[PDB]
Amino acid sequence: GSVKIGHYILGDTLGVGTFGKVKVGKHELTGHKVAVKILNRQKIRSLDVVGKIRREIQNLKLFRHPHIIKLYQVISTPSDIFMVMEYVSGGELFDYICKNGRLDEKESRRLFQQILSGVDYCHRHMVVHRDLKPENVLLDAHMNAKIADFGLSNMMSDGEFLRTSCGSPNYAAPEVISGRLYAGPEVDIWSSGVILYALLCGTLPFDDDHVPTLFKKICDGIFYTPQYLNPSVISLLKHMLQVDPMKRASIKDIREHEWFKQDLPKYLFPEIDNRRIMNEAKDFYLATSPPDHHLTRPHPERVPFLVAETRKAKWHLGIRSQSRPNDIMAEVCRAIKQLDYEWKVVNPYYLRVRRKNPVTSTYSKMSLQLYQVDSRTYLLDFRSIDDGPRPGSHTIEFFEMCANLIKILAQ
Amino acid sequence: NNSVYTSFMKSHRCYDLIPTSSKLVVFDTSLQVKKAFFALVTNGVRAAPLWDSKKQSFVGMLTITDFINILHRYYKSALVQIYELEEHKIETWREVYLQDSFKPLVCISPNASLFDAVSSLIRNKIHRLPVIDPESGNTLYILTHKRILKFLKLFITEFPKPEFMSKSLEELQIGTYANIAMVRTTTPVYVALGIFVQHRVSALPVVDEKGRVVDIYSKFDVINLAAEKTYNNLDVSVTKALQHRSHYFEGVLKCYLHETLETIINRLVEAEVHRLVVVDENDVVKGIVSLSDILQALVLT
Amino acid sequence: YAFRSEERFKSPPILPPHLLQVILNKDTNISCDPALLPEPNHVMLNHLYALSIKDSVMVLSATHRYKKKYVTTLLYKPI
Numbered sequence: 130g131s132v133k134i135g136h137y138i139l140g141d142t143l144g145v146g147t148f149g150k151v152k153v154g155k156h157e158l159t160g161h162k163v164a165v166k167i168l169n170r171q172k173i174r175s176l177d178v179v180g181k182i183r184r185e186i187q188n189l190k191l192f193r194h195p196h197i198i199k200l201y202q203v204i205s206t207p208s209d210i211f212m213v214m215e216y217v218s219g220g221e222l223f224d225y226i227c228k229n230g231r232l233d234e235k236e237s238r239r240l241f242q243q244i245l246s247g248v249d250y251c252h253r254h255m256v257v258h259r260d261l262k263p264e265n266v267l268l269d270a271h272m273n274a275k276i277a278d279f280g281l282s283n284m285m286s287d288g289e290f291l292r293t294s295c296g297s298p299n300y301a302a303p304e305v306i307s308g309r310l311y312a313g314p315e316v317d318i319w320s321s322g323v324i325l326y327a328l329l330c331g332t333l334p335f336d337d338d339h340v341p342t343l344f345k346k347i348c349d350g351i352f353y354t355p356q357y358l359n360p361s362v363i364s365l366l367k368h369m370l371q372v373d374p375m376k377r378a379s380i381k382d383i384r385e386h387e388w389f390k391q392d393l394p395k396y397l398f399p400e401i402d403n404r405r406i407m408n409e410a411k412d413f414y415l416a417t418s419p420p421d422h423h424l425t426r427p428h429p430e431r432v433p434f435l436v437a438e439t440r441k442a443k444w445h446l447g448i449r450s451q452s453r454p455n456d457i458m459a460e461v462c463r464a465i466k467q468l469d470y471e472w473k474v475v476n477p478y479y480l481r482v483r484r485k486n487p488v489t490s491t492y493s494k495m496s497l498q499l500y501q502v503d504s505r506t507y508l509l510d511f512r513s514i515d516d517g518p519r520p521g522s523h524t525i526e527f528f529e530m531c532a533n534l535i536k537i538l539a540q
Numbered sequence: 541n542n543s544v545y546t547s548f549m550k551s552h553r554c555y556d557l558i559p560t561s562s563k564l565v566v567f568d569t570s571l572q573v574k575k576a577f578f579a580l581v582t583n584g585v586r587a588a589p590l591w592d593s594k595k596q597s598f599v600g601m602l603t604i605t606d607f608i609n610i611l612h613r614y615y616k617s618a619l620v621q622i623y624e625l626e627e628h629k630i631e632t633w634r635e636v637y638l639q640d641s642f643k644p645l646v647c648i649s650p651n652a653s654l655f656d657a658v659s660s661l662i663r664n665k666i667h668r669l670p671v672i673d674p675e676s677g678n679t680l681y682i683l684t685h686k687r688i689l690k691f692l693k694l695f696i697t698e699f700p701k702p703e704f705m706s707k708s709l710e711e712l713q714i715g716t717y718a719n720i721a722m723v724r725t726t727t728p729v730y731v732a733l734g735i736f737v738q739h740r741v742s743a744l745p746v747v748d749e750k751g752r753v754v755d756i757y758s759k760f761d762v763i764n765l766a767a768e769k770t771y772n773n774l775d776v777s778v779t780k781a782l783q784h785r786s787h788y789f790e791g792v793l794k795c796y797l798h799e800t801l802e803t804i805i806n807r808l809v810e811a812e813v814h815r816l817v818v819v820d821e822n823d824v825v826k827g828i829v830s831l832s833d834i835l836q837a838l839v840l841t
Numbered sequence: 842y843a844f845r846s847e848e849r850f851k852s853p854p855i856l857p858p859h860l861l862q863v864i865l866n867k868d869t870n871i872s873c874d875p876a877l878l879p880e881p882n883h884v885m886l887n888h889l890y891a892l893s894i895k896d897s898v899m900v901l902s903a904t905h906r907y908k909k910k911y912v913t914t915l916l917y918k919p920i
């Protein structure tokens with residue numbers, strides 16, 4: 130016989146993929162073409178992630194984007210898990226670049242815009258596609274852009290960062306190659322930068338035959354710039370590929386850039402009605418950074434403080450100079466000094482404490498992680514929680530809970 | 541006349557009113573009043589929700605009005621005493637404030653309609669209505685008469701518009717012309733607070749010998765005394781107190797009786813003030829139209 | 842150019858740069874409502890920000906998020 134999932138019969142294999150190999154489906158009746166990713170249960174049972182796979186399928190499910198490979202349905206069985214996806218011909222962009230040599234402006238601009246909207250879509254949905262390669266992005270019949278493999282992707286959490294580092298050497302951000310904590314939008318921006326570079330020079334901006342010298346090249350923001358293009362794409366790339374994650378460009382920064390604006394359709398970014406729209410998103414909803422500039426009318430309630438001004442020194446959290454293990458121990462004694470109890474998770478410097486409300490039956494938790502600021506000093510972080518009528522406040526209870534703990538740690 | 545503005549408020553929750561990202565400070569009832577008021581000018585906010593550590597709940601609100609009351613209440617002379625205020629504490633002052641009258645904190649769920657909010661503002665006669673999520677119990681944003689008017693004109697559409705607003709102010713009889721609480725330019729800032737405590741008015745337009753409006757002293761203007769730490773001297777003129785911003789403001793926002801209601805609301809949400817003083821050719825006082833008047837001219841009409 | 846590379850296990854983890862950027866020390870425009878702040882990064886949201894206590898009152902704050910909104914709640918509590 131022949132293997133088939135639902136009305137889709139399997140067939141010729143497309144590739145190896147991240148986990149399982151992918152093959153082409155064909156509708157028994159109509160004959161439509163889809164791409165199914167075959168992940169063998171036996172192969173995914175060996176490695177142990179019981180939440181990573183759950184959230185993966187969860188995220189790609191809701192996603193609908195022209196440049197994001199759209200997950201249709203997921204068919205399951207004790208043998209292996211399947212995912213049917215939109216099939217497109219023209220292979221990976223890596224095959225397109227190499228075969229076509231070096232793309233020009235009028236072209237690269239088109240494609241880069243497309244890909245950047247897909248990742249913007251992802252980031253807006255609180256997910257980060259960590260491994261972004263021209264080898265991971267396909268092209269349809271019309272030679273558009275399609276982001277493909279979400280395997281290495283992860284879902285972003287509030288107040289949470291991402292430890293793990295994975296993937297090939299070249300597209301990995303200067304921070305993830307150094308195995309440091311990241312938010313995840315920036316690691317895509319850097320990964321998108323090196324993609325924009327390959328779409329121009331045909332060669333990777335950071336490439337070496339052996340590591341870490343590739344990482345050493347990546348950590349250093351120096352990279353070859355061909356006479357090939359104008360200085361605008363360079364100002365973009367250098368600000369995008371910046372070694373400092375704080376000095377890097379955000380998804381907003383690229384949108385505002387000049388070279389990125391030219392010949393860019395409206396559909397990609399979901400945005401007299403232009404001035405009227407200002408007010409809808411203007412000073413009313415959010416605060417604008419200081420605009421050297423024309424004098425503007427300050428809000429009446431903001432002037433009296435201001436007219437009399439022209440200090441404010443607010444810190445991070447409790448920060449001492451003691452040793453890593455010698456610190457937490459001097460802390461936990463105070464954590465147990467009160468009624469509050471502590472169950473510490475994986476890291477010895479990471480603790481999760483929670484206590485019952487003294488007035489009511491409510492209970493608020495939190496998270497304390499000990500970081501290292503430099504050679505001579507360490508820092509303790511305080512983070513709130515979540516769970517899923519009341520005479521008390523979850524936000525305030527968090528403060529009082531911390532304040533009481535901090536009181537004993539200081540005086 | 542209620543076909544549109546009245547329905548609109550019932551069809552939109554206070555949620556849409558809340559800024560994307562805002563800032564709010566809350567004081568403990570155990571905190572000293574002196575430190576509290578200074579915190580108000582440093583953070584920019586004119587209102588803070590009062591939190592009780594023992595009751596573990598929100599007992600009430602703290603506005604500039606409080607600073608006005610306690611200033612007029614305990615005062616001896618500009619030069620003789622910095623005494624009463626310093627030691628006094630938030631809960632201790634609430635005790636002598638509630639000694640006369642008992643009025644618990646009012647609040648509205650962010651899921652409640654905008655019509656419920658505008659009701660709680662007129663019914664309770666209050667400018668600060670905190671929105672608190674009943675599920676979490678956390679105060680989100682402090683609703684304001686200004687915040688609503690802005691939201692109203694900005695969000696409301698073009699279509700149902702053509703009829704009632706066009707009618708002029710003089711003919712609509714909106715706002716109080718009967719007794720106007722005002723201060724001279726030479727009147728001490730103390731007696732200004734004395735009028736602020738007697739009448740629940742939120743501002744006192746200043747006048748010269750001719751009765752013309754050369755400036756305005758708002759309940760918010762007095763917080764500057766705490767900002768500049770000049771609150772010790774209450775013997776100064778309101779003109780002397782408003783002399784700090786005198787090099788900044790354009791003039792006194794106002795309107796005319798024969799002007800359309802429409803033209804008034806626009807100029808009002810754009811200037812982002814709480815009221816306008818209607819006048820004549822001589823710029824002499826006629827009456828006062830505040831946001832409370834406009835809001836009360838909507839809910840029923 | 843394959844394959845997939847390594848990770849760093851040296852502990853304690855180094856303090857991420859994002860957290861050191863506080864929205865309360867940033868300065869907004871001059872014309873906006875004073876109670877307004879820019880849209881905060883989702884990573885720094887649940888974290889607590891304590892102000893140096895130069896006063897006998899401990900003042901600490903954090904930026905908590907609503908369903909679509911964000912709020913920075915500052916609390917002044919004496920020692």
Ligand SMILES: Nc1ncnc2c1ncn2[C@@H]1O[C@H](COP(=O)(O)O)[C@@H](O)[C@H]1O
Nearest residue numbers: 600601603605606644645646666667668
């Ligand atoms: N929502 C409220 N809860 C408790 N007290 C309030 C509230 N609103 C106003 N007040 C009191 O009224 C004064 C503020 O008035 P106003 O400036 O008009 O909002 C202060 O003295 C407060 O104690």
Ligand SMILES: Nc1ncnc2c1ncn2[C@@H]1O[C@H](COP(=O)(O)O)[C@@H](O)[C@H]1O
Nearest residue numbers: 715716719720721741742743828830832
């Ligand atoms: N300076 C004033 N003198 C007399 N009445 C006033 C004055 N300002 C406002 N009002 C009235 O008080 C209400 C507005 O109060 P408020 O929202 O606190 O400014 C309206 O009904 C006005 O008619």
Ligand SMILES: Nc1ncnc2c1ncn2[C@@H]1O[C@H](COP(=O)(O)O)[C@@H](O)[C@H]1O
Nearest residue numbers: 429758760791792793813814815816817
């Ligand atoms: N009708 C007005 N004309 C001129 N300035 C005003 C007027 N109303 C309010 N202000 C200013 O705005 C502040 C008071 O705002 P509010 O608490 O909303 O009435 C003060 O700094 C006043 O100087």
